[PDB]
């Protein structure tokens with residue numbers, strides 16, 4: 001048990017203690033059944049890893065200064081680029097290569113039943129050969145992943161509000177903090 | 193038992209355990225004890241915010257007539273600058289009150305379960321829980337020494353009086369179009385030609 | 396017990412444990428529609444669905460219609476909001492109606508098969524992770540899980556009170572929507588305007604004077 | 613419009629027929645007094661004639677070569693060109709009242725078969741029971757589809773059959 005999402009409240013009797021990120025947060029009781037809970041642990045770890053990659057990518061694009069995460073498909077809604085170097089491909093070819101590669105990798109992952117923490121060639125540096133620090137890094141992994149999921153939904157909502165990138169909106173929040181937030185928006189709070 | 197109307201038959205569920213128990217419930221709204229717990233806590237909360245409201249409407253107007261950033265009336269506080277738009281202040285208000293309000297609600301749901309400081313886990317409210325009457329750091333000057341049967345009753349009497357006073361300020365302002373201390377100054381200048389019936393018929 | 400008419404005889408199908416334990420039972424079936432218990436189960440469900448969508452609809456009428464008389468929320472009249480929104484929108488109304496027919500038909504068929512069999516939508520395997528949280532809550536028409544997030548239906552000493560508040564507010568919102576339609580055809584103004592006219596002159600501006608609702612007088 | 617028919621407010625034989633009926637009524641009118649009851653009755657007749665032609669031109673009816681209103685009996689074509697009020701709304705109104713009559717008669721028959729004198733309750737009508745079923749017959753489509761879905765609308769094969777079958 002990593003803590004308590006709301007102190008005073010009790011932990012549900014279906015979430016076991018030896019699980020990465022068990023704050024007891026299940027109001028809707030979605031995982032009272034073990035097969036459902038197994039599938040959701042798998043899905044939570046996969047969503048967390050993809051969201052860490054996506055948030056790190058959007059931060060890297062905007063900090064290195066080639067637009068934001070929203071300007072990146074504008075050549076294809078309309079030439080691609082990467083590290084400023086142009087990449088000689090088109091939308092249909094990219095969708096073909098991505099579909100083949102992700103279908104292959106995803107299909108190899110889906111053949112294994114309940115593999116969440118695979119190791120092996122996925123884990124070349126061998127940090128998870130101790131069975132205790134590996135579990136502490138599982139807890140760090142699920143916390144970073146939940147934080148990056150919240151960060152990416154914040155990116156999407158923040159861009160739907162202001163129409164700007166997250167680093168530029170952070171610059172606005174540092175310049176005029178009481179004049180640039182979700183309430184000068186005019187969208188997040190509909191009044192005034 | 194001091195009745196709201198002496199000689200009348202009082203509702204049997206009212207027993208003096210609540211502060212200010214005068215047997216007044218003609219609509220029988222407190223029959224269920226669960227609803228009576230909710231209504232007791234809501235009476236306390238509406239009463240305390242109304243006491244702060246009547247203080248915040250009196251004291252700037254009581255200081256505006258005598259010898260201070262603005263002497264603006266209480267219902268024109270929105271049309272003033274306050275270094276920021278009111279929407280951002282609304283957002284800050286809703287975040288900090290989301291925290292405090294849900295913490296009070298978790299105390300009311302499970303009494304004896306919202307007492308210790310979450311960040312600095314040595315700080316703690318004592319075990320005299322009493323939902324609605326926290327204690328500890330909320331009583332910093334060491335009061336409550338008295339039984340509080342008396343202090344709780346004074347608290348609910350001043351609170352009912354200020355709830356009636358704020359329902360006043362809304363009504364008097366919406367009728368007369370003006371400020372309440374100027375309304376009291378007119379009632380002191382000529383009480384016999386300035387009554388509710390006089391102004392209502394002068395409409 | 397309480398009844399819609401004191402002194403009238405209560406129908407014998409609304410005076411059983413299964414009928415008296417339902418919600419909002421006042422013995423009102425003069426046309427005898429619920430004599431069949433299967434019909435009364437189906438009509439309980441139809442009343443619950445009409446109650447909830449009527450409350451949501453009448454709230455969408457009133458709260459923008461009340462706040463449009465104050466400062467914010469310049470919202471059109473409820474009999475003009477579809478035209479104004481589809482001018483504001485991006486899709487044609489036919490495509491939007493087709494999308495809502497598919498998205499509503501899925502959910503509706505879920506509810507339909509739950510009405511047919513109560514322990515139905517919790518087949519292990521039939522849903523990805525929905526399947527655990529899509530059973531009933533031992534009373535049909537009152538689901539649990541993702542429906543009702545805040546856990547207000549957990550305390551049993553409040554439960555009949557919440558039921559009866561829901562069925563009263565629902566029947567009253569159905570009366571409100573039939574009123575919205577009727578007033579719209581009779582007067583030609585919005586319901587807040589009708590309320591302002593009945594408050595401005597009650598004894599002369601009502602349905603006895605509109606020249607439509609009773610034309611013999 | 614539909615089937616080559618012009619609208620009646622656009623048709624010319626419709627106006628000619630209106631003018632012809634007014635001409636016959638005023639030729640009958642021109643041989644009386646003013647405040648006399650035949651003149652009053654004929655002016656009421658002319659008022660009803662003008663009101664009738666104005667109402668049929670207002671309702672959007674389709675006229676032919678003879679200037680007479682034609683009805684459209686096709687649900688889709690009527691609902692497409694605004695003619696549901698002439699066949700489609702009347703057929704659902706009729707089916708409501710005809711099933712009303714039939715369902716009240718059926719409930720009276722089932723109520724009087726459960727006594728010791730069904731023929732006596734068929735010759736001398738039980739008026740309170742008949743008025744009770746006549747008021748309760750307003751929910752006849754719901755009650756009919758429920759009795760359909762329970763398998764109690766229909767008698768089984770305990771019916772009378774001939775030697776052949």
Ligand code: CLA
Nearest residue numbers: 020021022023024025026030031040041043044047146149
């Ligand atoms: C992205 C999908 C996702 C999935 C599949 C899970 C799955 C899980 N979470 Mg995790 N969680 C997530 C994201 C997710 N989480 C995010 C983003 C946060 C930070 C807010 C958390 C914070 C969190 C805590 C603190 C805890 C969990 C826990 C759990 C486990 C038990 C809960 C359960 O059975 O419900 C299954 C969950 C789902 C089916 C989620 C799917 C999405 C639902 C259906 C709709 C959500 C929409 C969302 C509210 C929209 C927000 C919009 C915004 C503008 C308001 C389960 C393994 C508990 C645990 O034991 O950890 C392992 C626990 O204590 N979660």
Ligand code: CLA
Nearest residue numbers: 150151154157158161162169170172173180181182185188
């Ligand atoms: C992951 C945490 C996180 C952080 C650090 C930020 C930060 C920011 N947001 Mg974003 N946002 C987030 C999540 C986050 N957001 C989520 C989940 C949503 C969907 C509800 C949004 C939707 C959103 C909109 C619509 C807007 C912003 C804006 C902003 C900027 C101004 C401050 C503000 O008003 O915040 C918004 C405040 C909230 C969303 C409430 C806080 C709720 C979070 C998730 C609780 C967790 C915070 C944590 C306890 C403390 C911070 C931890 C952090 C240091 C890692 C600021 C850079 C504004 C902007 O563009 O500035 C110019 C703006 O208009 N955000």
Ligand code: CLA
Nearest residue numbers: 613614615684685686687688689690691692693694700703
């Ligand atoms: C009694 C037999 C009968 C007959 C001979 C017709 C004849 C007609 N119908 Mg009608 N219709 C009927 C009963 C009938 N209808 C009933 C009972 C309904 C309700 C279910 C409809 C609902 C309906 C609609 C919605 C439409 C028609 C249309 C038509 C016209 C062209 C279609 C056709 O040739 O299909 C031969 C008819 C049948 C085999 C009888 C069954 C009718 C089915 C249920 C509906 C057919 C609609 C058709 C697929 C739409 C074609 C579009 C067209 C532009 C090509 C034709 C005059 C269309 C029209 O308006 O044309 C201008 C049209 O849009 N009908």
Ligand SMILES: CC1=C[C@H](O)CC(C)(C)[C@H]1/C=C/C(C)=C/C=C/C(C)=C/C=C/C=C(C)/C=C/C=C(C)/C=C/C1=C(C)C[C@H](O)CC1(C)C
Nearest residue numbers: 026027028029030047050051054057058069072149152153
């Ligand atoms: C837990 C629970 C339990 C209870 O019972 C109930 C409830 C409460 C319901 C629940 C909750 C839930 C939740 C919270 C959810 C959320 C989620 C999320 C947010 C996700 C995201 C998630 C997210 C994600 C993955 C993301 C990812 C992303 C990515 C890849 C990105 C990408 C990109 C980039 C790079 C950039 C470029 O230019 C573009 C793009 C393409 C854009």
Ligand SMILES: CC1=C[C@H](O)CC(C)(C)[C@H]1/C=C/C(C)=C/C=C/C(C)=C/C=C/C=C(C)/C=C/C=C(C)/C=C/C1=C(C)C[C@H](O)CC1(C)C
Nearest residue numbers: 424425426427445448449452455456473476569570572573
């Ligand atoms: C019980 C009984 C019994 C015996 O036996 C017999 C008898 C007597 C016959 C019976 C009775 C009956 C009755 C009375 C009924 C009625 C009902 C109703 C009223 C419904 C409504 C109902 C109603 C409803 C649902 C409604 C809903 C609504 C809605 C959603 C709305 C929506 C909307 C909105 C928001 C806005 C926009 O802009 C538009 C719209 C779109 C419009």
